[PDB]
């Protein structure tokens, strides 16, 4: 079947999709669907479909968690979050990242701090991920910076960041494992800077039961009926 006939067969399921995405997200998913309609090769169409899969999931992730969807290009790096949130330590950040300058450009799906987006409570987010992981067996990985063996304190508030990595791919374990491995160096770097950060990473795939994703079930039916069917019809034909 011709690419342009697959798009037509799935114009309604992709309109239901684009209708539920954050404004900047749905505009991106819309531009990509057109590229797929005018795709001159099964290669370029796959590459476009891949980007819709991840972008549309990240928007439904922002929705379920009531966070802000920020298009990749507009996403902050690790260096930008410290510069703005820990200026007294950015200079020492740069000094301790001479042999690992790539750390500065690391760009998670969500770079938040507690009241760079702001979040009410970092400990609340970590509890929700740890809860679903324990109740539903969803693979997560979590790392918290911790200078020496320092204790939490009740007499003073510290500024803190929350780094989240999401993903919609078949290999859920490999993603959480490879994500948490990339942040280990920076987590141990923040420890040596006395900066409190928390790294959370998760992933969903299409075999995950519809009630156990990191996005609302409704969003799940929206992705399976559109981006999944596409991939089915994109290979078969």
């Amino acid at each position: 079947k011709p690419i342009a006939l697959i798009c037509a067969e799935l114009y309604k399921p992709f309109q239901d999709l684009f209708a539920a995405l954050p404004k900047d997200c749905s505009e991106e998913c819309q531009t990509l669907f057109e590229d797929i309609r005018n795709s001159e090769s099964h290669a370029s169409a796959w590459s476009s479909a891949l980007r819709i899969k991840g972008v549309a999931y990240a928007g439904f992730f922002s929705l379920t968690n009531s966070w802000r969807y920020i298009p990749e290009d507009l996403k902050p790096t690790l260096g930008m979050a410290i510069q703005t949130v820990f200026p007294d330590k950015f200079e020492k950040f740069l000094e301790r990242t001479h042999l690992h300058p790539e750390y500065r450009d690391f760009t998670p799906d969500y770079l938040m701090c507690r009241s760079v987006q702001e979040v009410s409570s970092v400990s609340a987010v970590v509890d929700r991920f740890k809860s679903k992981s324990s109740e539903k067996g969803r693979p997560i990985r979590q790392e918290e910076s911790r200078p020496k063996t320092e204790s939490m304190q009740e007499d003073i508030e510290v500024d803190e960041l929350l780094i989240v990595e999401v993903g919609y791919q078949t290999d859920i374990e490999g993603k959480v494992i490879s994500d948490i491995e990339k942040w280990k160096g920076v987590v141990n770097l923040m420890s040596h800077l006395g900066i409190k950060v928390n790294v959370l990473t998760c992933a969903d795939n299409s075999q995950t039961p519809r009630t156990d994703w990191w996005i609302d079930e409704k969003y799940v039916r929206l992705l399976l009926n559109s981006i999944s069917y596409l991939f089915k019809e994109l290979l078969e034909n």
Partner: antibody
Amino acid sequence: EVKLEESGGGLVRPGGSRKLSCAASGFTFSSYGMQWVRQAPEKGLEWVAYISSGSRTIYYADTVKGRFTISRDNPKNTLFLQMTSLRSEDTAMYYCATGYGGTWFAYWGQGTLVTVSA
Amino acid sequence: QIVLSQSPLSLPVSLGDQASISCRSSQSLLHSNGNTYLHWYLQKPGQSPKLLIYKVSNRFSGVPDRFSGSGSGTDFTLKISRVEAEDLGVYFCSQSTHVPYTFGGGTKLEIKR
């Protein structure tokens, strides 16, 4: 007046278990981390466990890890210590304490004596 | 673990005189949030401990001003400006900068006679 009242001490055979409780009064107990400290007879103080106000963070001394559980019921203004697989070296006076605004031991109970012995 | 070393073990002191107790830390007690969680307690014989000083030099409410503390990093001192008969007992420093929270072994204040 801030007061902490421990209960639950007594005689316990080695290998046995005991649950200690601490009733808190005179402050909003739910807003503060709570601690257990112990003192073997004729010895110094030895910290046992900490629990944050919302129970999200819990700390243990290595000597009790895997045997003791700290917990709290904030609506009931009560702190607990579940002790299991007790050894004679656990024989101590057990105090609950709190900082009422920090991780130092500002307020102490009168303590309750736990004797582990056959 | 952070080891707190108290000196002297025992401090005979005449009524009215000053007393000083030292507490040395095996690692800095400066927390990454800027505070230093080194505290001083008194345990009179047969009673539960009482806080005297928290975070190095802050006198706890109700504590007589003859008690004071000073220091930073790894070295800390508790001063009793003018010893009273009631000041009899064991003095402990303790730190809550690092888990596990730890105590020194205690200094036994002894009244000279």
